[PDB]
Amino acid sequence: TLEKFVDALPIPDTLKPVQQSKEKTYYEVTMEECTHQLHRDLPPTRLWGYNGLFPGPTIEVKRNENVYVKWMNNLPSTHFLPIDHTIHHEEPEVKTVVHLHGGVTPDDSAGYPEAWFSKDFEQTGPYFKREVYHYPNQQRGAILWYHDHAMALTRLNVYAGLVGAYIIHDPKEKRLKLPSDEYDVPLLITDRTINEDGSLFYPSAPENPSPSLPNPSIVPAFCGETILVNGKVWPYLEVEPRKYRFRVINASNTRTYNLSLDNGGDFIQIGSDGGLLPRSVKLNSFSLAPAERYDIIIDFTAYEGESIILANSAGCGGDVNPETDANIMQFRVTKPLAQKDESRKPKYLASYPERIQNIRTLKLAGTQDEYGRPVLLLNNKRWHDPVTETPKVGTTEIWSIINPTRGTHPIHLHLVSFRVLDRRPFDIARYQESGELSYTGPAVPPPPSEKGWKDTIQAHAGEVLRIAATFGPYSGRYVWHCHILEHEDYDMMRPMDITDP
Ligand SMILES: [O-][O-]
Ligand SMILES: [Cu+2]
Ligand SMILES: [Cu+2]
Ligand SMILES: [Cu+2]
Ligand SMILES: [Cu+2]
16 A cells, blocks of 8 residues: 655645735635646546645635635536436536535525536526625634535535635634644545546445446445545654644545544644634544544644654544554654744633524434435435425524434534534434334533534434524525535435525
């Protein structure tokens, strides 16, 4: 297999505005098919990249900065990854739309799966309204990320390389003196399988297919043989012996990580999806499902000279392999100090996170299609079925998510962030047989990591997860879905209409 830790970690350049004034910041980002080397020992790989880059450029904005991004499709008219036409029913083959994940945006700038467009906007989906997206950024400082969200193609377009980081900086947080600038580094983690000729591999069918099954066929999960951070296989990063802030983003299709440091040292978590936690949290390890973000500090001060592996204990389709997917990247504490470390790891970060208008019971279920494939469904509805999740703007609801399946689903709501209330185990067999919910244990409050603001949340097997969200500030057409892209595309995604009575 590919030799670990021979390439330096790329750090995406920060995007520069096409035009900027005190009143408006205007960016242009074009999707392009490009070639990039993923590892010292591979031929260059054909990829799709925002501005031809994988990951795309990091976008940095201030809270309340009035930002517009014209996302453009300049991609080939044919895909290079296997499209399954059976999963969705004259349209272009390559459809794209950019979703600012965690963004608080009007609905027509949110990247709705049916607001897609082909090259040069020649054809546009049924809910397309605009070319230039508006991001008012009137929301908490946080780590966001952007990625393709096109109907029935998300797993493919994201796997092709269409992901990037988007950081909101709230100037009110500057006084905390968290590690900043060169000492504040995003880590976009994406697992991939790569052929010997350097081409991306994505499966065209499940294992040992019926013959029979459409070809290509969607698969219900994807586990890559190799781990990349910031577009490089198993990279190293030379760090100074001092505190760093890392914006850890899981940009993988299916894979969940469980991260630790191989010297047994601690992370300090300072932030979750929705921004700074009320208090910093000392952690030895953490799980990180698709689309979750952990904003962390690692203090290398006492580790000068050392090589420390960011390790992973979570398997994907099997036990983790010590020589491969057990590794993420390697820190080498060998960079000389550019200056005194004047950063801080404060205990007190932010304030702690209303009438309950509605309690919504939701189940994670599904059925089998005519080919015998599993179709994952929220409340046994298709995407296309009339909308049922219709919160009223400005009101708070509790959503109670029942998971009687065998696996965890990272459930994501667009627009809002939410609080995690609790998780409670139930009798799966009794639920499947009668629809009756019978608890087998008391409710468990969230771990400290989940006591702030979240937008993507692990709903574990045989549990009811309860979250609470206030729906706003915008009314309109949004989405909620599982963020395992293989599940999202078939068909674990539903409209979420926030209404204005
Ligand atoms: O967010 O998909
Ligand atoms: Cu997302
Ligand atoms: Cu989202
Ligand atoms: Cu799922
Ligand atoms: Cu989404």
